[PDB]
């Protein structure tokens, strides 16, 4: 085949114009003429705490927790009791 001698000129010429358009698209110098964790960690934190220790905590059943784990022989701080030591492991 091969380009037709009258299509290798409509691509000859239109490519020449595309090259000028893209040159014109180029921006001149000056073209664009225009005319610290404490910040998000600490400040947000104080607020949250304010909320969690003075609303949630205060209201009923808002922050509930699985009972603490108590094993044999470990003391209960609040009541003072000492969990009996378990039956001796024979083996």
């Amino acid at each position: 085949s091969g380009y037709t001698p009258d299509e290798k000129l409509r691509l000859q010429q239109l490519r020449e114009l595309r090259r000028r358009w893209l040159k014109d698209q180029e921006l001149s110098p000056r073209e664009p003429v225009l005319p610290f964790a404490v910040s998000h960690v600490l400040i947000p934190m104080w607020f949250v705490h304010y909320y969690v220790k003075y609303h949630m905590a205060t209201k009923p059943y808002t922050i509930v927790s699985s009972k603490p784990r108590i094993f044999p022989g470990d003391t209960i701080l609040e009541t003072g009791e000492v969990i009996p030591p378990m039956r001796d492991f024979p083996d």
């Binding site: 699985s66 009972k67 784990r69 108590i70 094993f71 044999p72 470990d74 969990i83 378990m86 039956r87 492991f89």
Partner: protein, 121 residues
């Protein structure tokens, strides 16, 4: 391979997993003593052991968990406690294997004895 025996060659000799103690404990065992649970039903309930984990090894577990809360920053030091628990359990898996083998054999007893009585008459 137990399966190959049960599914390929024989059907009665091999026992069914759904009913492992197909036979009463007394058989071939005069006054066999039952397993003894060391931990207190309360001890477990206070150590918040998951129901499943309340095995006959619950007692060595509570120990592990003890040494895991204590020794907190160090998660690599309650190692003897884990061996123990595991052992207790390996020593339980083995039991559960001994019970299965005992059943197996006992059911065989039935077969062989069936023939024993099947003696020509």
């Amino acid at each position: 391979a137990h399966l190959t025996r049960r599914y390929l060659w024989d059907a009665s000799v091999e026992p069914d997993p759904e009913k492992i103690p197909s036979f009463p404990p007394d058989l071939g065992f005069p006054e066999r003593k039952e397993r003894v649970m060391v931990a207190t039903q309360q001890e477990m309930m206070d150590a918040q052991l998951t129901l499943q984990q309340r095995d006959y090894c619950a007692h060595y577990l509570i120990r592990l968990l003890k040494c895991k809360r204590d020794s907190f920053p160090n998660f690599l030091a309650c190692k003897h406690e884990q061996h123990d628990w595991d052992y207790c359990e390996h020593l339980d898996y083995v039991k559960r294997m001994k019970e299965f083998e005992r059943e197996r054999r006992l059911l065989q007893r039935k077969k062989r004895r069936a023939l024993k009585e099947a003696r020509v008459a």
